[PDB]
Design a protein around this ligand. Structure first.
Ligand SMILES: *C(CO)[C@@H](O)[C@H](O)[C@H](O)COP(=O)(O)O
Ligand SMILES: *C(CO)[C@@H](O)[C@H](O)[C@H](O)COP(=O)(O)O
Lengths: 316, 316
């Protein structure tokens, strides 16, 4: 049989898309969206009914234009989540407005707003992960949300500082990125091609996994962002991996069995004192790749949120 | 006569070096050092006596090796400042350990430590600027230090967010960078050469100057970091400019009179509400150049501080 089926022996497979066709086809445990994927999903013609439901619901919630745009985009992201939840047994990840990434209180508020929308549609909190960028502020938002029974997916995770802070905050799940790390190394070093074991994204997720297991942290490690099946296969054994349909297709069509790569067997070690905000800021900014890419992912996801608001704006 | 003499009609000229020869030769109003310049100055043979005083003074302050290294490097930076103050009528800028850039309290403490060292040598606070990186944390350190009668030079300033936050904190002086901005644009865009008026470093300082004067802020604007005399001449009229000896030489040997370029004639406008930390973080990370270069300058200055510690370490 196939590499996708072999991988599911070791790793829970998650679909990185807003497209329901992919859920029918690959039957993943969970799904992840983000604002770019939400923007792309809104172009699917069969999803016009979901945009229409969102716009109509928004107009019923208030008579103010600014608030209707905000309500409709939020409701659209949730509507897509609801469709996906019909087809996956596990969780949907839905990302908060990236414009709030450096504001803890606004992020907590928005996370709660989305959770309410899901709850009001009949969905309980154990079906949802609210996606927040792994800034200090997002990590603080998440720590508080976890205490209020809202589980979070900490995304755009590039630096070890970020990984340590998320563990210490007790977040439900992290999404350490692989492909964007590779992207950065190509664009900023001499070395433009990498064996899978040398892929610096793969090295990053592997080192994070080890650290998490060796200190007994229970935060789920979900590798995300992939450029090729080599990266994915080198990470077999990661708790979860979220994978775009293109690469799911490739795995499903490749014959053969693969080995588990990622494991920890040793003793549980003593945890250190919690990293403080100053230590975290210092160690994060030691990593020029992480500096660039965290900020960039936030900028891009915000642009896509604006585009989503422009689109909705034209329909009110 | 010469371009250097013409420039001093419009702008207070500051020497960007730890080398006293340059002070004798160009007779600047003020001087600036930073840790790289302190590291380079320590190689000057005539400065061995200053390293020797610093190491001897450190050994008198404690019997602990780690503390002696720290004390000696601080005392060395001050000893250099003291030599320079003999030769300039105005201020010396001395930078705090860049490893403290994201720690407000440690930065305040280090700033005070340096001020004490100068005071103990008979120098009062109106002869000194403590240099701090323009992180949110450094800007908060500076706001507090200014209230305690310690004047600060806010450095590594790249984003408008940084410029606005420093103005609103009432800091004594800012050092918006020019040449490093140019460096970034060369390395990250197609356009590798710039007319002086198009130089994005020159545009940045010009826009900051305008904003400061149009809101009546009294923070001194001192352009720093230069790659060519074109950048400097396009900024004639800036309150101050700190300039390396290489470029001072070029100005002094270049014949002709230059025209003032930077002025604000209009009406004083009403100030906005203060930028908050979240707004500042958002707007700073909108500027990919600023993101990269602030973090980088901090890393490089810290490496140079480590090198300074290695050197001192070998002499205890
Ligand atoms: C959420 C992570 O849990 C996902 O939707 C990620 O944003 C994507 O995996 C990122 O992929 P790209 O790097 O290709 O945008
Ligand atoms: C302090 C600013 O007041 C200066 O010593 C600056 O660090 C230098 O001007 C930086 O110059 P380079 O960008 O050429 O290193």
């Amino acid at each position: 049989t196939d590499k996708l089926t072999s991988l599911r022996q070791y790793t829970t497979v998650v679909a990185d898309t807003g497209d329901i066709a992919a859920m029918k086809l690959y039957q993943p445990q969970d799904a992840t969206t983000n604002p770019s994927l939400i923007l792309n999903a809104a172009q699917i013609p069969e999803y016009r009914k979901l945009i229409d439901d969102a716009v109509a619901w928004a107009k019923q919630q208030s008579n103010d234009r600014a608030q209707q745009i905000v309500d409709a985009t939020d409701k659209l992201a949730v509507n897509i989540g609801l469709e996906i939840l019909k087809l996956v047994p596990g969780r949907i990840s839905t990302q908060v407005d990236a414009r709030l990434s450096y504001d803890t209180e606004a992020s907590i508020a928005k996370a709660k707003r989305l959770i309410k929308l899901y709850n009001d549609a009949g969905i309980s909190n154990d079906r949802i992960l609210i996606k927040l960028a792994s800034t200090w502020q997002g990590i603080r938002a998440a720590e508080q949300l976890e205490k209020e029974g809202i589980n979070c997916n900490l995304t755009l995770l590039f630096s070890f500082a970020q990984a340590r802070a998320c563990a210490e905050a007790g977040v439900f799940l992290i999404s350490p990125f692989v492909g964007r790390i590779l992207d950065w190394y190509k664009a900023n070093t001499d070395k433009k091609e990498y064996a899978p074991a040398e892929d610096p994204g793969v090295v990053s997720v592997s080192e994070i996994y080890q650290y998490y297991k060796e200190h007994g942290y229970e935060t789920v490690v979900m590798g995300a962002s992939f450029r090729n099946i080599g990266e994915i296969l080198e990470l077999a054994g990661c708790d979860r991996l979220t994978i775009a349909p293109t690469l799911l297709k490739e795995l499903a069509e490749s014959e053969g069995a693969i080995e588990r790569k990622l494991s920890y067997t040793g003793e549980v070690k003593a945890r250190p004192a919690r990293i403080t905000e100053s230590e975290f800021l210092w160690q994060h900014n030691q990593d020029p790749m992480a500096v660039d890419k965290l900020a960039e992912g936030i900028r891009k996801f915000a642009i896509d949120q604006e585009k989503l608001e422009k689109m909705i704006g034209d329909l009110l």
